[PDB]
Amino acid sequence: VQPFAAQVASLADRYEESFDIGAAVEPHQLNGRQGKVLKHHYNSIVAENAMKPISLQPEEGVFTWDGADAIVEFARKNNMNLRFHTLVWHNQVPDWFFLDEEGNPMVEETNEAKRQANKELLLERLETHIKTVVERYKDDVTAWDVVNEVVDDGTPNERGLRESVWYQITGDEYIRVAFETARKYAGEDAKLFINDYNTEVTPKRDHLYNLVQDLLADGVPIDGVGHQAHIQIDWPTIDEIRTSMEMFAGLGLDNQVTELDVSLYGWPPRPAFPTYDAIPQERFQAQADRYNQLFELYEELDADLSSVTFWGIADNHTWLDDRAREYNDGVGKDAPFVFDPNYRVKPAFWRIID
Numbered sequence: 001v002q003p004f005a006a007q008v009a010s011l012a013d014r015y016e017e018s019f020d021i022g023a024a025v026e027p028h029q030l031n032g033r034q035g036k037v038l039k040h041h042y043n044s045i046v047a048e049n050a051m052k053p054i055s056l057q058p059e060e061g062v063f064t065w066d067g068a069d070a071i072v073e074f075a076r077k078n079n080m081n082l083r084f085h086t087l088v089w090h091n092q093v094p095d096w097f098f099l100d101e102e103g104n105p106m107v108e109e110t111n112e113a114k115r116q117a118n119k120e121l122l123l124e125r126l127e128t129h130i131k132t133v134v135e136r137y138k139d140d141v142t143a144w145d146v147v148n149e150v151v152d153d154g155t156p157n158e159r160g161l162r163e164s165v166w167y168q169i170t171g172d173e174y175i176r177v178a179f180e181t182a183r184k185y186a187g188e189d190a191k192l193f194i195n196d197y198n199t200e201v202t203p204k205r206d207h208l209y210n211l212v213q214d215l216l217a218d219g220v221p222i223d224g225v226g227h228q229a230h231i232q233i234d235w236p237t238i239d240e241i242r243t244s245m246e247m248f249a250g251l252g253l254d255n256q257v258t259e260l261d262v263s264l265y266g267w268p269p270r271p272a273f274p275t276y277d278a279i280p281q282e283r284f285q286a287q288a289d290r291y292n293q294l295f296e297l298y299e300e301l302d303a304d305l306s307s308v309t310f311w312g313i314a315d316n317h318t319w320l321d322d323r324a325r326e327y328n329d330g331v332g333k334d335a336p337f338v339f340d341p342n343y344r345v346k347p348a349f350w351r352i353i354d
């Protein structure tokens with residue numbers, strides 16, 4: 001029988017000379033077995049949802065801080081670092097941002113002068129959201145996801161920027177405003193990140209590379225690149241991950257791995273195992289080999305990698321299950337972490353603690 005997580009050596013202790021070991025959390029996960037695992041294994045946390053724009057400012061000028069504050073207070077009490085996720089995203093963002101003075105979607109406006117007025121209004125709203133949040137949390141946050149997922153996976157425009165509402169309304173200016181505002185209110189020492197997934201693979205990797213070089217050349221304050229690392233057992237390759245981190249380090253940017261999970265499935269994730277107990281032990285072994293290689297690499301890159309955060313704690317809670325159910329008629333279970341649903345260690349744990 002595998003031991004419980006609190007009975008084995010701490011991942012944070014294991015990696016103390018290399019990088020933080022973090023987890024994404026909800027306020028309800030700060031106690032019980034999850035809270036115990038958190039305190040034992042991790043020295044950094046991030047909010048899975050509580051610090052997203054819709055979670056903090058759900059209506060204009062109506063700020064709701066309780067969940068985010070609970071996470072901050074836990075980080076303080078437990079001497080953990082804290083990543084802020086996220087100031088800007090095109091999901092989990094309230095629609096009121098993108099409505100004009102008449103209450104209609106800014107994207108539908110056809111008068112270009114009115115479009116420019118809408119751009120200014122949205123950028124003002126964005127400045128206010130960032131100022132208010134940053135002023136509250138600036139003494140607690142150790143890395144800010146200033147913008148999230150602003151780069152496209154394909155090439156819909158020359159710069160490979162995601163054509164979300166932010167882009168449709170403001171072009172790239174929301175990205176500049178976000179970084180400049182975060183710097184202004186968080187201070188000169190605050191570590192400002194651009195976060196994205198599929199940062200290991202092109203064309204996205206190069207769109208992001210070009211975007212950061214463009215920002216930097218314009219004096220936009222950017223300190224680091226967040227690699228979500230929603231990955232699989234076989235993809236992307238170790239050398240793909242390596243090359244991406246080296247590219248960003250070459251620009252003088254920090255790397256963080258921000259949302260790590262190693263799914264048991266390819267894309268699309270079907271067919272999925274219908275329950276956790278249906279998952280064959282061999283698949284956990286393949287995951288363990290993957291995890292060993294990933295953490296060997298992260299250690300190799302530790303002069304340019306400051307923090308490695310998993311997108312959850314243990315296999316009882318993961319957004320990958322929603323994904324599995326979506327592609328398998330409501331039934332399916334993934335298992336992306338080194339701790340199982342009862343907080344026992346998995347084969348992967350043993351291969352990254354050694």
Ligand SMILES: [Cl-]
Nearest residue numbers: 090162163164
């Ligand atoms: Cl989009």
Ligand SMILES: [Mg+2]
Nearest residue numbers: 292351352354
């Ligand atoms: Mg190992």
Ligand code: NA
Nearest residue numbers: 018302305306
């Ligand atoms: Na490091």
